Design a protein around this ligand. Structure first.
Ligand code: PX9
Ligand code: PX9
Lengths: 153, 153
C-alpha cells in the first residue's frame, strides 16, 4: 500500500463510523461471519498523545462481541501499529463523510468507513479506485438495514 | 439484468472454462465454500437442438462434488431456463477467451468465465463494467493456482 493521506489530522477522525465495504487479499480473511478480518468499526477515539483507540464488533463463538484495541502512532501521521507486527494505514478521508484504511502484515484488508448508515456512491467510487492498485480477491458491501444491526446481521 | 449478447452462437461456447470471478446480490449466496451459488464451471456442452448442458463442481457435505445440469433454450438465444424457475443470461463472450453470465430468480449471481487458468485483466474489466448496473454485495476472484484445483481450494 503506497497511498496515505497527506496532512492527516487524527483528532478529526473522532466519533461514529460505519464499515460500508471491506476488501482483502485472501477470501478466507472475509468469507465467514467469524473470518478473522470481518471487523465492524463502531467508533474512533484518538488520544491527546495521538494514539488511536478503536471500538469494533466481531463475531466469535456464535455471537457479536464488543472489542477495543489501541493503534500506536508512528513518525508517519497516517500509519499506526497493532503488534503481537501489523500496520494500520489511513489512505484518504474528508473527516465529515468517509475514511478509507488498510490493515497489513503479505496479507491485506481495507475498508470504506462512512459517518451515516447510507450507501455513499462517491465514497465507494474512491474505495474502488484505491483497490485498483492492490491484489484483492474478496469484496463485501452492506445495505443501510445491516449497517444499523450488530455485526451487520 | 438488461445486458444480453446480441447474436449469440451457443454452439461456439462449447468446451473448457474457468470461473475466474463471481459476484452476487447477497453475501450468503457466495460467502462459504458450501454457499449455494459457489459453483465452479468445468465445461459447456450445447445440444444440437440448442439446449446447454453444464458440468460444474460444488462443495457439499465437506467435499468437492461433480454436477451436471441442462439449461433449456427459450425464444431468446442468450436466455436459458433451470426450473424447480431460474434464468441463465449470457451477457457477453468472444468465444476464444471470456464469457460473462448471470443466473437469476430478486437474487442474482454473475461469473466471468475464461478459457485458460490465467488472470485476464481485460475480461475482469468487462465483468466490472457489467456489474456497475447491478446490486452486488459480494465479489470473489481466484488465482491461477486455485483455478487448477478442484473447487478452487
Ligand atoms: C482509521 C483506523 C481504523 C482502523 O480500524 C481497525 C484496525 C484494525 C482492527 O483490527 C481488529 C483485529 C485485527 N487484529 C488481529 C490480530 O490481533 C490484532 C488485531 C480493527 C479496526
Ligand atoms: C454460459 C452458461 C453458464 C451457466 O452456468 C451455470 C448456470 C447455473 C448453474 O447452477 C448451478 C446450481 C444452481 N441452481 C440451484 C437451484 O437448482 C438449480 C441449480 C451452474 C452453472
Amino acid at each position: 500500500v503506497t497511498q496515505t493521506m497527506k496532512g492527516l489530522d487524527i483528532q478529526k477522525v473522532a466519533g461514529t463510523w460505519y464499515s460500508l465495504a471491506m476488501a482483502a487479499s485472501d477470501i478466507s480473511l472475509l468469507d465467514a461471519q467469524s473470518a478473522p478480518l470481518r471487523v465492524y468499526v463502531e467508533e474512533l477515539k484518538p488520544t491527546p498523545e495521538g494514539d488511536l483507540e478503536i471500538l469494533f464488533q466481531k463475531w466469535e463463538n456464535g455471537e457479536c462481541a464488543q472489542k477495543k484495541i489501541i493503534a500506536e502512532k508512528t513518525k508517519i501521521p497516517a500509519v499506526f501499529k497493532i503488534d503481537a507486527e501489523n500496520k494500520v494505514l489511513v489512505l484518504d478521508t474528508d473527516y465529515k463523510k468517509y475514511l478509507l484504511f488498510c490493515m497489513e502484515n503479505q496479507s491485506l484488508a481495507c475498508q470504506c468507513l462512512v459517518r451515516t448508515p447510507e450507501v455513499d456512491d462517491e465514497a465507494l467510487e474512491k474505495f474502488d479506485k484505491a483497490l485498483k492498485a492492490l491484489p484483492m480477491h474478496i469484496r463485501l458491501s452492506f445495505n443501510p438495514t445491516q449497517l444499523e444491526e450488530q455485526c451487520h446481521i
